[PDB]
Design a protein around this nucleic acid. Structure first.
Ligand code: SF4
Ligand code: 2HP
Ligand code: 2HP
Length: 219
DNA sequence: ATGTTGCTTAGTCC
DNA sequence: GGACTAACGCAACA
């Protein structure tokens, strides 16, 4: 199917009852956004369809993409990520606002799970379910040369996608593994506020991941 | 009030 | 693998 079909069918997905419930349950639970409209639906990926770089996240944040409808948009992860994408020369502007004209250059964003999960922790079954969308979505990104896993969950999800063994591909920030066809699998700590605000992942460190991804992608 | 909640990683055990 | 939890730093939240 093409992207239009992907987005249409994805947005109507209700395979995970716990997530179908949670994505709506959180609406109105955060003071700053009470009364505001929430996407509260599966989150389609965003970015350059001809991207050479794929940034693969964990899942929608309750008041992030689950609210705005766009990956990493509206939360602390995006406040950290988007400016760095621009600093690396991979986007039209530093900020991401729903409905704006933000363009990503050579990069596409999505995640392992597409509906907000309780405690930001999807179950193995939920991951297995949404992996079907990963197959469809990644199939629509023919030019990707570098797959960047943001966090352990994201990495394990990509390993499953590529049929790679976890034992041979451990999660460590900066890890780099070869993929068939001269492609690359990179691992980075996730951009979550609890990684960036604690100093586990600094702006310097993540920008480096982006610059390396560009180098490996021929950009 | 100022204590609690919420935002992934690296150890433990099965 | 999968379930459980101590530990970061910060600030919205109550
Ligand atoms: S997480 Fe994925 S598979 Fe599960 S309901 Fe949402 S879109 Fe469907
Ligand atoms: O909701 P966001 O997860 O994609 O940060
Ligand atoms: O945000 P304030 O809750 O402490 O009033």
């Amino acid at each position: 199917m093409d992207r239009e079909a992907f987005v249409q069918t994805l947005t109507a997905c209700r395979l995970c009852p716990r997530l179908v419930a949670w994505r709506e349950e959180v609406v109105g639970r955060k003071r700053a956004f009470r009364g505001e409209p929430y996407w509260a639906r599966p989150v389609p990926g965003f970015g350059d369809p001809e991207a050479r770089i794929l940034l693969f996240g964990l899942a929608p944040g309750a008041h992030g993409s689950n609210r705005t409808g766009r990956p990493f948009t509206g939360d602390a992860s995006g406040a950290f990520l988007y400016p760095l994408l621009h600093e690396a020369g991979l986007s039209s502007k530093p900020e991401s606002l729903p409905g704006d004209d933000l363009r990503l250059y050579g990069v596409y964003l999505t995640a392992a799970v597409r509906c907000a999960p309780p405690k930001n922790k999807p179950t193995p079954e939920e991951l297995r379910a949404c992996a079907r969308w990963t197959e469809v979505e990644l199939g629509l990104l023919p030019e990707v040369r570098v797959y960047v896993a943001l966090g352990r969950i994201a990495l394990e999800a990509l390993l499953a996608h590529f049929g790679l063994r976890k034992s041979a591909h451990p999660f460590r920030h900066g890890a780099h593994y070869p993929l068939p066809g001269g492609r690359h699998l990179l691992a980075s700590y996730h951009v979550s506020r609890q990684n960036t605000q604690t100093g586990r992942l600094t702006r310097e460190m993540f920008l480096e991941v982006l610059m390396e991804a560009k180098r490996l992608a021929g950009l």
